[PDB]
Amino acid sequence: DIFTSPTRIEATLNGLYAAIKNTGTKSLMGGKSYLVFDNRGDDVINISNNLVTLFNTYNMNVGITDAENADTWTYAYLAINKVNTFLQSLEGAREVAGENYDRYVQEAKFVRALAYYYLNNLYPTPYSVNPDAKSVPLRLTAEAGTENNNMPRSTVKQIYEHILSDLENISALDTEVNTYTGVTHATQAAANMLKMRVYMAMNEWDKAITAGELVTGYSLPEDVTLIYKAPYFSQESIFSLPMADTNIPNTQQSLAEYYYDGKIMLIDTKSGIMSKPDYSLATDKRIIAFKGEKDLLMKFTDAKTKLQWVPIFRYAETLLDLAECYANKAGGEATAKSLLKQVRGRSVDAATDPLNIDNLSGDALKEAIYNEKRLEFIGEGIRGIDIMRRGEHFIKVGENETINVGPSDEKYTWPIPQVELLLNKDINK
Ligand SMILES: [Zn+2]
Ligand SMILES: [Zn+2]
Ligand SMILES: [Zn+2]
Ligand SMILES: [Zn+2]
Ligand SMILES: [Zn+2]
Ligand SMILES: [Zn+2]
Ligand SMILES: [Zn+2]
Ligand SMILES: [Zn+2]
Ligand SMILES: [Zn+2]
């Protein structure tokens, strides 16, 4: 814990990655807080009728005392404070760190950047609607006391701008493809993926392209099932949260526990992506692999071991994000189409595809990219972010009720939770 050796520095660094995943009793992006982003979306449905298993998130009804709100807040800020403390301790251990000092700093900053990024996609009105919308307190000092709980919220723009600062120097980060360490520590590719996501949320299509075009060395394997079974990564995998028998999430906190038995999450086959005929083709690899009997999503179904890794960034995302950027750029349509074709062609045979990608333009092209992203990333912690960053309504047409929540509605966002309101007297200043 005192940084007297490299192995002690690295143990604490690995604790940063654990802190954004889950603890022994609660979960963040390795469990329920990743599931939050699918529940906010419109491609799966939550039929649990149980607030303990994210029903209020799905129904766009999260209040100041909901468990998922308190937990996301508490564990994100715990992870952030661990990074702040790590960075301060590392400053006093420069010689012990030796040539690896910069990598350790830049990795720790990536973890803080990721934590803030997820908070910025729950609490504020999106930047695309209002860049001055209040988001969350920007806590950047190592704090062992309650001395500094009082702090105003920074804006959605300010949070993004700080994230960009934490990602500004990445040249000491690793660059390995298809190794445990390359997928489970932040690489330059991982940092650039986050930078791309941030710039897209700000409509900075050119800066997003520059970041995402730096992601090199990955590919799209022909088998779409590789990343959900041993060794839980492939040549497509950029960054994931790994699991081990001794650190899996507790009861009803893992991904697999939400999908495996049909009692919580199902595929929305009435109105979501897999209700659309071009995105439910019987010979699509993703439909064959993942569209289960009784509408179970078959990506994460090992609830016995819970060992499946949580995929944060993979290369199909790089391509579809780049496709979206180029579709928003004057003269970019030909490139957008070629990028879309790479991803769709991996799963859907072009010779018999009802979608003629070469003839898409304007709105039809954008919609094809949005729909491909919906099918490719069903269940992967993304859908509710794409809806929100674009300032779109969350529209969920069910048999007996329709959810329709837009940016002028209070329930578009999560409110600052009671855990914070009790301690922070400046929260509304
Ligand atoms: Zn010395
Ligand atoms: Zn240095
Ligand atoms: Zn900053
Ligand atoms: Zn390396
Ligand atoms: Zn590392
Ligand atoms: Zn069609
Ligand atoms: Zn192919
Ligand atoms: Zn209604
Ligand atoms: Zn509207």
Automatic annotation (TrEMBL):
<feature type="domain" description="RagB/SusD">
    <location>
        <begin position="300"/>
        <end position="427"/>
    </location>
</feature>
<dbReference type="Pfam" id="PF07980">
    <property type="entry name" value="SusD_RagB"/>
</dbReference>
<feature type="binding site">
    <location>
        <position position="185"/>
    </location>
    <ligand>
        <name>Zn(2+) 3</name>
    </ligand>
</feature>
<dbReference type="InterPro" id="IPR011990">
    <property type="entry name" value="TPR-like_helical_dom_sf"/>
</dbReference>
<keyword id="KW-0479">Metal-binding</keyword>
<protein>
    <submittedName>
        <fullName>Membrane protein</fullName>
    </submittedName>
</protein>
<feature type="binding site">
    <location>
        <position position="162"/>
    </location>
    <ligand>
        <name>Zn(2+) 4</name>
    </ligand>
</feature>
<feature type="binding site">
    <location>
        <position position="107"/>
    </location>
    <ligand>
        <name>Zn(2+) 3</name>
    </ligand>
</feature>
<feature type="binding site">
    <location>
        <position position="278"/>
    </location>
    <ligand>
        <name>Zn(2+) 7</name>
    </ligand>
</feature>
<dbReference type="GO" id="GO:0009279">
    <property type="term" value="C:cell outer membrane"/>
</dbReference>
<feature type="binding site">
    <location>
        <position position="393"/>
    </location>
    <ligand>
        <name>Zn(2+) 8</name>
    </ligand>
</feature>
<dbReference type="InterPro" id="IPR033985">
    <property type="entry name" value="SusD-like_N"/>
</dbReference>
<feature type="binding site">
    <location>
        <position position="174"/>
    </location>
    <ligand>
        <name>Zn(2+) 5</name>
    </ligand>
</feature>
<feature type="binding site">
    <location>
        <position position="95"/>
    </location>
    <ligand>
        <name>Zn(2+) 1</name>
    </ligand>
</feature>
<dbReference type="InterPro" id="IPR012944">
    <property type="entry name" value="SusD_RagB_dom"/>
</dbReference>
<comment type="similarity">
    <text>Belongs to the SusD family.</text>
</comment>
<dbReference type="Pfam" id="PF14322">
    <property type="entry name" value="SusD-like_3"/>
</dbReference>
<feature type="binding site">
    <location>
        <position position="176"/>
    </location>
    <ligand>
        <name>Zn(2+) 5</name>
    </ligand>
</feature>
<dbReference type="GO" id="GO:0046872">
    <property type="term" value="F:metal ion binding"/>
</dbReference>
<feature type="binding site">
    <location>
        <position position="102"/>
    </location>
    <ligand>
        <name>Zn(2+) 2</name>
    </ligand>
</feature>
<keyword id="KW-0998">Cell outer membrane</keyword>
<keyword id="KW-0472">Membrane</keyword>
<feature type="binding site">
    <location>
        <position position="222"/>
    </location>
    <ligand>
        <name>Zn(2+) 6</name>
    </ligand>
</feature>
<keyword id="KW-0732">Signal</keyword>
<feature type="domain" description="SusD-like N-terminal">
    <location>
        <begin position="1"/>
        <end position="199"/>
    </location>
</feature>
<keyword id="KW-0862">Zinc</keyword>
